[PDB]
Amino acid sequence: MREIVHIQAGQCGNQIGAKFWEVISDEHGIDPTGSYHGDSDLQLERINVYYNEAAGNKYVPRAILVDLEPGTMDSVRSGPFGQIFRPDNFVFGQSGAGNNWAKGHYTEGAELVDSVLDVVRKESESCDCLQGFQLTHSLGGGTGSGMGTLLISKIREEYPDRIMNTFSVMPSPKVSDTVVEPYNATLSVHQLVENTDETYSIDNEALYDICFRTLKLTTPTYGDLNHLVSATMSGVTTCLRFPGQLNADLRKLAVNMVPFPRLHFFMPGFAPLTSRGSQQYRALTVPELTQQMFDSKNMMAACDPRHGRYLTVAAIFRGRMSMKEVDEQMLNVQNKNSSYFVEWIPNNVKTAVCDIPPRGLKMSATFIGNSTAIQELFKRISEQFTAMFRRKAFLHWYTGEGMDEMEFTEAESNMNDLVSEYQQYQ
Amino acid sequence: RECISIHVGQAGVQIGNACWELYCLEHGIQPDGQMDDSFNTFFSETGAGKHVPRAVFVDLEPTVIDEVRTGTYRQLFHPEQLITGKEDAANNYARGHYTIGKEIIDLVLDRIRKLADQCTGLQGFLVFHSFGGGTGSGFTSLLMERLSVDYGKKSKLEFSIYPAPQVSTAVVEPYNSILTTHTTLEHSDCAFMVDNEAIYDICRRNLDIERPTYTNLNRLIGQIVSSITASLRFDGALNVDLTEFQTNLVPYPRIHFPLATYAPVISAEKAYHEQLSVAEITNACFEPANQMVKCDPRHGKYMACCLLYRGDVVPKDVNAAIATIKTKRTIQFVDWCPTGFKVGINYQPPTVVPGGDLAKVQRAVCMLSNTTAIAEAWARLDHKFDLMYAKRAFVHWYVGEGMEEGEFSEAREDMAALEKDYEEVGV
Amino acid sequence: RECISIHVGQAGVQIGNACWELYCLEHGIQPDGQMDDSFNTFFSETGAGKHVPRAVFVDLEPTVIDEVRTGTYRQLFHPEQLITGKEDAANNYARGHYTIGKEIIDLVLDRIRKLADQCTGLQGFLVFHSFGGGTGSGFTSLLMERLSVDYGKKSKLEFSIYPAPQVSTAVVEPYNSILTTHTTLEHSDCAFMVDNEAIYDICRRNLDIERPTYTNLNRLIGQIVSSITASLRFDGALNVDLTEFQTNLVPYPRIHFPLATYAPVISAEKAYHEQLSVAEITNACFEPANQMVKCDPRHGKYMACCLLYRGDVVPKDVNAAIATIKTKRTIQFVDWCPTGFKVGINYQPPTVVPGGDLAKVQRAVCMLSNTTAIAEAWARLDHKFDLMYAKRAFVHWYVGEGMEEGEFSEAREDMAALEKDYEEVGV
Amino acid sequence: AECNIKVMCRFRPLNESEVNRGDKYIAKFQGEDTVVIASKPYAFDRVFQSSTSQEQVYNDCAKKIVKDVLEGYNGTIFAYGQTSSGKTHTMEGKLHDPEGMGIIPRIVQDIFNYIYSMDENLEFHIKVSYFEIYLDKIRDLLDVSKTNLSVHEDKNRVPYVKGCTERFVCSPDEVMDTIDEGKSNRHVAVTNMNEHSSRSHSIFLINVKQENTQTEQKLSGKLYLVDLAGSAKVSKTGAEGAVLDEAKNINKSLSALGNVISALAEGSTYVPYRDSKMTRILQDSLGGNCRTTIVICCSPSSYNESETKSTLLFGQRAKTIKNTV
Ligand SMILES: Nc1nc2c(ncn2[C@@H]2O[C@H](COP(=O)(O)CP(=O)(O)OP(=O)(O)O)[C@@H](O)[C@H]2O)c(=O)[nH]1
Ligand SMILES: Nc1nc2c(ncn2[C@@H]2O[C@H](COP(=O)(O)OP(=O)(O)OP(=O)(O)O)[C@@H](O)[C@H]2O)c(=O)[nH]1
Ligand SMILES: Nc1nc2c(ncn2[C@@H]2O[C@H](COP(=O)(O)OP(=O)(O)OP(=O)(O)O)[C@@H](O)[C@H]2O)c(=O)[nH]1
Ligand SMILES: Nc1ncnc2c1ncn2[C@@H]1O[C@H](COP(=O)(O)OP(=O)(O)OP(=O)(O)O)[C@@H](O)[C@H]1O
């Protein structure tokens, strides 16, 4: 009932998705081998929405892992829960992309798309009725940016009505771990803005800033950053995984958050966030979390929300709590800070609650916001794109793969249009 | 006397599991499903020593249905009545009425007809839903149009939860209510509205419960809809059936939206220190902040109201109470219907849930009062709707379902057609 | 009733670690951080069985912060509240306010607002600082200007340590006080002053402690500021809240500098030999040498004073004491406010620190008294300032920071504007 | 430099289903520029009556448009209206009949007739293309293998279709055989309200590239003939199954351009042409270097009096818009 198929494109997609099955398997009570040892009977109902039942009380996930280099598949297979994944989904080529969007989208990826398209035919048929696809990729690089967005277009041609949710992490000016970030980003958003109905824009700068102020981690690795983003992907897909007083489907947030088809780039966030050295000195009540919810330095995007205005926001709470004090809190943030909300909508806040919180915690929530502050991120990368594109630097490799400079100019026409769209409703 | 109930959406099932919690306790029915004529209007005789409820819990999302199937009231409800869908409406009137509704209404309508065939004294219906949601707005609009053409003459009680002035759970809920009200206006006989924030200050001020949930809310709303049908269950000095509320509340065929208010709502420790009597409850219900809908009654005029009581209440002191309320100049009744009073008494007192915050009282009162105080709400809903309608926001989903701006324009002018006659009769 | 405290500079943290030493002992709070309504105004309930203090210890030099973080009260204070800077103010009002202040006030002000959001009964604030230092003069002037424009209406208790006539720790402390008083005059509602040398002869004469430290001093000052807020913590026959001290002491908006004095201050062996009663303590506080500020009261006249008591003290004998004090011609009350008496009683007696030099007493008293006896101090501070201002000494650092002679000239004439009205009301 | 967009109205007689019901005749004509509907005037350029013939509408509507596209500028033509409004009957009509045809064959016949009058040295290059939208994909009619096509932008950032078939014609008889293949292969449905129900947008683009060898001056003019579908009410039409899937696509297109035409009327800063691909191909019509001609076909019956009201306010709101020509 309302199944979801997980896709993991690119090196970041395989790693960010490996932690997604890590955290949700704990609250569901799934063994590392695949069996079930949960404590509550409520965890057994909606296991089909992400896993497939097997013999011997064993369960396997519907994870479509795809990449062009075999190193990421071997590392994930040797992980904590690497053995639970089925081997036939681990499709992979031999040669990597080398951070080239043209190779993994036209020439190198087209040799691999024929092998993975037949796999999703098997998984889409095994479920009763698919709800939406939860893809994970990164705009940086060529594999996840090129081959990841390719199958977005192919699947949308098959399913012109199903949901296509993606958790896309974008580049940033200060944190630049690759020289080809603006070109890979500019060509990817041309397709994501038209094809996908939902998009969660994540920035690596905020993942470093969020871990400095409140977690106080002195040596945070990639595994620490994955725990933050994986919890947001789990929090959004929790209402259709456990029962609650008001369950919100993934599509019910799409109807509330997406007032126009292109305007779907969301601001992810998470609460509570407190270090081990200050977890005891904090109140887990709803007034404490709500103030930290809409804090300027809480979301997973470097853009300041004070420089924009929220068009619509959501706070899907999670855990046993009284919804009376919730509604007063969402009333206060929109009333006390009405200048930072659009006047042409009466209420910019969505609500949702669940009864069974995660392990170790009592109450929690997850933030999803579509705001005008994101246009500062799309324009700065466009300046990076426009600075190098005007001299045609680092484009001769793209033309070798059958590309043309006209498509780069057409992608710029999509880039400068969507930033002006945010300027209209600001 | 028999009547069939139906619950739709997330709002309905929380009213379903709560309102049916006290009915089985009222008739001494254990939760297993077993223990002469009082329970006939809501429970049938299942052969020998077993009952079955006369309700249908339809919902597109099965996240609530499997909870009830795995809940404590498993053996009570029939497994066929717990109807399940395939995917949620997503706060879309279009998706819950046209695409997902048509492929399941053929099963629901046939299920309603086969249960209604064995009835002999079916008085009417009562619907539990909420226009602010998707399933409660889209699917409820489908069945109401499709059964009204079939039956038509029978009565209907639409128990709809409306949005608050400032409080709101979603952002698209004005679009859900503006469309469904265009269809609900001509077919719904009478719709008793309920507001979500109006319950918040009631329990906070009177019951002094500072962290309740919906389970405390629906236990009160389930008690309210039990008192309006209490005359048919148990005997009374002045009984009133389901057709009584069609005439003395609906003076015009389109003005069929009465307010509601209930009293006494007193906590356990506060009940002993406060004297329960007819005078204060008759004054408490007319108090404006003591209502289930946050709308100023002083901004309009009252058309007609009914004073249905509970417990051992003599018929004389209630007449003196309404007589004294007539003398109070703080209120003002409309000249078009001055004698808009309808007294009613019942011998069976209010029940009490074990562990519930509501206290035991020997007498109670419920109120349905038609007035022109609701026109400010429809005026407010039209103004806030115009802010989003100008920018054409949250429209691409509805036309993406199949709708268009035409019916949206017909829905806007329909409220304008409703604004003029509320102000006209208010003179 | 809630109130948020803030400590600034070297003077604040020695007041912080000392004044909070007895509050946790008053409410039976162990140093680890755990053990119904008396502790609410200074300690919040952190979920279940854990407390957290309502204070912010800001300081540019972290030499005191790491000591408290590695001290014995580590588990009590929130690690986020212990704010740390980057480099000290160097006894420069300009460096602690403009350069170093601006790059950290954005973090401190946001920290104050988020803690004040969850408050419901926030009566006001109380600031601990010292104008003779750099951080206490510069950074405190920044936040007081920046929060007053934000909140404004709320009350503020400035507990500032002033310089002595002949005793002095630094040489630039007149320049620190002359600048900050120009800003503190219009925004600070009421500032209770304390003198450093005034404590020296008190413990030497009464307590006969001939080698104490700041730990003995701040334990007494922490007890003084605990008694002024004691009416809000525990019940009393005649309670007074935080707004009481703003009206009955500040008759004019610029004359807002009351003196302070406290009694009884008796040692352990001397307490058993001396009879504790209301008469001698009521005469002892009005004794001039028994004050926390070395200023001759006989050179002026008293405006108004408050007699707030502690412990089991009946309300009658205190009325007889102030009546007898009115008859004593050794003092002289001003004709503009002859009935400047404000009695106050509290049932909770004074506490005692283990190992401290202060002895247990069944009754105590604290005094805040507005008078014209401070004008001689400001006249002295202007004369000594003129010696350095004429030669333009210690000026190249301030203009080296960014200042100029204009604000220095405006600061000089501001005291001249304060000198005239103190002499005018003294008539 | 600034040419006002013309929005001409037309009515028709009642259909066989309407006269059998007995719908009332609401259309009241006052003059020629304005029309009264329930005591509400609507100022337009030209109001065509129900008794108008196909030729009578053609010589008044798109007669001067032939001169505009041949002079060097561009032309853009597309109708609008609800279901059973008479849009396809106005635009394509009966091709083989001497008089029952619409606008498309009368235009292309006049293009070849006008070319015969001028001098021989003016060399022309007429290329034809025809594609329809189907399940939100540009379905090509001349080639059945292609199910979806990609749209790109030219040098000056005017959107235009790429990869579509471009058959270079030389005689007007070849175009008549081409449109019959497109009309015959067009996916048409059957409903209660309309038999020949055009449930999709059919674009008929003609790129008129001409050159004068004597002066050596090159000129080009685009000619969009885009027939839109009707806003089908499922309560009145009774859509079910595959017809609902047709309803999802067509309603998005008319509502998408409805946001565009309302944005230009109120004077928005962005003008969201990016709402749908149907607006991209029409972006040159509403904000390009082309003359827009909006033929408002409406039914005079009272059975859809509210839909006709929405269509007239839709038309007059478009009259205030001016192109950046
Ligand atoms: N939030 C996270 N971001 C990551 C993680 N790993 C990488 N990244 C970020 O994504 C950027 C590029 O993504 P990838 O690591 O997947 C490069 P890819 O595997 O697609 O190409 P090749 O490895 O060269 O075959 C990368 O520079 C990081 O900024 C991660 O685990 N979590
Ligand atoms: N007072 C009250 N209102 C409820 C309750 N449950 C749901 N609601 C109403 O439901 C509305 C939210 O939308 P839902 O009815 O939950 O919609 P849904 O059934 O979850 O399905 P979708 O609309 O598709 O998301 C709120 O505005 C509430 O007013 C309840 O238990 N008590
Ligand atoms: N009475 C009393 N005064 C104190 C105490 N601690 C500091 N002071 C005051 O502090 C002043 C000295 O300057 P500091 O406050 O130490 O300045 P700082 O914090 O070291 O920073 P800089 O001014 O930049 O050197 C003296 O004039 C004292 O009056 C204390 O414990 N008791
Ligand atoms: N001007 C007219 N005079 C007489 N009959 C007409 C006229 N216009 C249309 N019709 C009738 O309408 C029928 C064809 O309907 P048509 O294809 O025009 O629907 P439509 O309005 O074009 O649909 P849509 O609005 O979806 O394009 C024909 O049978 C024809 O008799």
Numbering used by the authors:
A (entry chain U): 1 to 426
B (entry chain E), C (entry chain A): 2 to 36, 52 to 443
D (entry chain k): 5 to 329
From the manuscript:
Microtubules are cytoskeletal filaments that play various important roles in cellular processes, including intracellular transport, cell division, and establishment of cell polarity. They are highly dynamic tubular polymers assembled from α/β-tubulin heterodimers, which are arranged in a head-to-tail manner to form protofilaments, with ~13 protofilaments associating laterally to form a hollow polar tube. In vertebrates, both α- and β-tubulins have multiple isotypes encoded by different genes, which are intrinsic factors in regulating microtubule functions. The GTP bound to β-tubulin at the E-site (exchangeable) is hydrolysed within the microtubule assembly proceeding via longitudinal contacts with α-tubulin, while the GTP bound to α-tubulin at the N-site (non-exchangeable) plays a structural role and is never hydrolysed.
To investigate the architectures of α1A/β2A, α1C/β2A, and α4A/β2A microtubules and explore the impact of α-tubulin isotypes on the structural features of the microtubules, we characterized the structures of the three kinds of microtubules in the presence of GMPCPP by using cryo-EM. The microtubules were decorated with K 349(E236A) to aid in the identification of α- and β-tubulins in the reconstruction process through the “seam-search” protocol. We then built the corresponding atomic model for each of the maps, including the non-seam region and the seam region. Similar analysis of the lateral interaction between α-β and β-α contacts in the seam region suggested that the α1C/β2A microtubules display a subtle longitudinally contracted divergence between α1C and α1A in the seam region; the α4A/β2A microtubules also display a slight longitudinal contraction (Cα atom RMSD of ~1 Å) between α4A and α1A in the seam region. Taken together, our data suggest that these α-tubulin isotypes do not show obvious lateral effects on their microtubule structures, while α1C/β2A and α4A/β2A microtubules exhibit slight longitudinal contraction between the interdimers in the seam region. In the present study, we assembled α1A/β2A and α1C/β2A microtubules, determined their cryo-EM structures, and found that they displayed similar structural features.
